[PDB]
Amino acid sequence: AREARSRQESWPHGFSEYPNLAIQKFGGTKPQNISQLNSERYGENWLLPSLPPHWQ
Amino acid sequence: VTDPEALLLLPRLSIQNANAISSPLTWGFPSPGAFTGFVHALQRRVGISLDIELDGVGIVCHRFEAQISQPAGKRTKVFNLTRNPLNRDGSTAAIVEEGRAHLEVSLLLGVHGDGLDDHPAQEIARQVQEQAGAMRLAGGSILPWCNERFPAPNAELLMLGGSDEQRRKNQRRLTRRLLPGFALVSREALLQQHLETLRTTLPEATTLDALLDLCRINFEPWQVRDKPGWLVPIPAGYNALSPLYLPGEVRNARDRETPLRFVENLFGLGEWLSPHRVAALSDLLWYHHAEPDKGLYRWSTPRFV
Amino acid sequence: ELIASGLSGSGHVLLEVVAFARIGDGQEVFPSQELILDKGDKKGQKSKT
Amino acid sequence: YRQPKQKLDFYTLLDNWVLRDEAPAVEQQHYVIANLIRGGVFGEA
DNA sequence: CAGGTAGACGCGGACATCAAGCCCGCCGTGAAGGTGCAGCTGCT
DNA sequence: AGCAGCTGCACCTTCACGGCGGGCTTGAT
Secondary structure, three states: OOOOOOOOOOOOOOOOOOOOOOOOOOOOOOOHOOOHHHOOOOOOOOOEEEOOOOOO | OOHHHHHHHOOEEEEEEEEOOOOOOEEOOOOHHHHHHHHHHHHHHOOOOOOOOEEEEEOOEEEEEOOOEOOOOOOOEEEEEEOOOOOOOOOOOOOOOOOOEEEEEOEEEEEEEOOOOOOOOOOOHHHHHHHHHOOOOOOOOOOHHHHOOOOOOOEEOOOOOOOOOHHHHHHHHHHHHHHHOOOOEEEHOOOHHHHHHHHHOOOOOOHHHOOOOOOOOOOOOOOOOOOOOOEEEEEEOOEEOOOOOOOOOOOOOOOOOOOOOOOEEEOOOEEEEOOOOOOOOOOOOOOEEEOOOOOOEEOOOOOOO | HHHHHHHHOOOOOOOOOOOOOOOOOOOOOOOOOOOOOOOOOOOOOOOOO | OOOOOOOOHHHHHHHHHOOOOOOOOOOHHHHHHHHHHHHOOOOOO
């Protein structure tokens, strides 16, 4: 998508941007005290945005 | 089951530190379960003595502010925390993260009881407002409106009373009071139809919900497929995990005269509308639906479409 | 006595407190500071918000 | 004039003067002191 | 104590080229961990 | 002298893990 906008050469694929993520951490600096899958991913709950629009 | 005979309008309330993190996958505006628990608390405190039954809340959210920050070189955000007191022996305490937010929201609520008479017309709404000031909405206290320019009173608007032209005049005079806001509604049939559309020889259930929230800026020529309005995922109730235990068996319960049951979150879809493109104000009300023998403790906006 | 009459269930007292402090022209006032654990990466961080 | 091929510019004469202790003729010394009178950013990398 | 009626306000065509856009050095640290077991004093 | 209770210490997992942007909502007096 970067260097083939004017060209017709376009792959059969894509991407996703996911704006406004928020990271949340459960174990402070020793995440293995919570669980084992919490050690695989260190904190990073990666919460999705669901916010109301601003009027103007 | 219920259709309100009158509406009560509380003016623009303010909440200083509400709950931002509403669910294990979403953040932002709080859950409507908090508002339904709030109106049930108002019913338990005032509704018994005045012979009125309060049920249903329309959420507006005139404005919303969150206490977040974006780190340098990253597009993700983090929360601003508090500093709890020390444990003992001078040791600092382990941090447990939580988010906060500031809300300005008004809510209209439908009363249907036969305890409204000819003499009580305005003191009912005043007695409701005087009790809804010393309470909290999502863990955040309600700001009390001290000495300012001009105050804001409640309203007790009867639904069936009046001609049909006067009925549309009453609907317009109520809609003018909350026009610069929005409204949260539940769209489950749209999510099910998009499930039926997206399922084309492949199995998927929950990435459907992830698809309606992201920005599909990818397409073969690029093109950005749009969506109808602000679509947002919300926590719409719980689902059961364990069988229901008898009221005195769970060790360290909240109270010992209620059956206990282990549940988990469910996820649905919702939309933020404008309150002038609905033409029905007995709509937009949220209700509980329990089904106590199979779990699935849900809340929704019925009779919408 | 007003605070005591409010604390005893009778009323829910609402007070409004205003404080005037005389510092000097153009001096520094100190608001609250936020606890931010993850400042991202060098060359762009802030270290006081 | 005073191109780096013919070694008679300010940078070449200054680097020959202060580093290797070989002063040029007096006219080019006038030119390099007049450069320090004019002022600028003459730092290396 | 007083003070006017009426009607109309123009056309055309054009608006310039040339050359360049700085180097250097560096970006703070401290505090934010549960759980199980051995062993030590104090008490009945 | 023998259980209850408090304090000190060893054990354990994992390298940050990209930026030219990206959406959809706003009234009538």
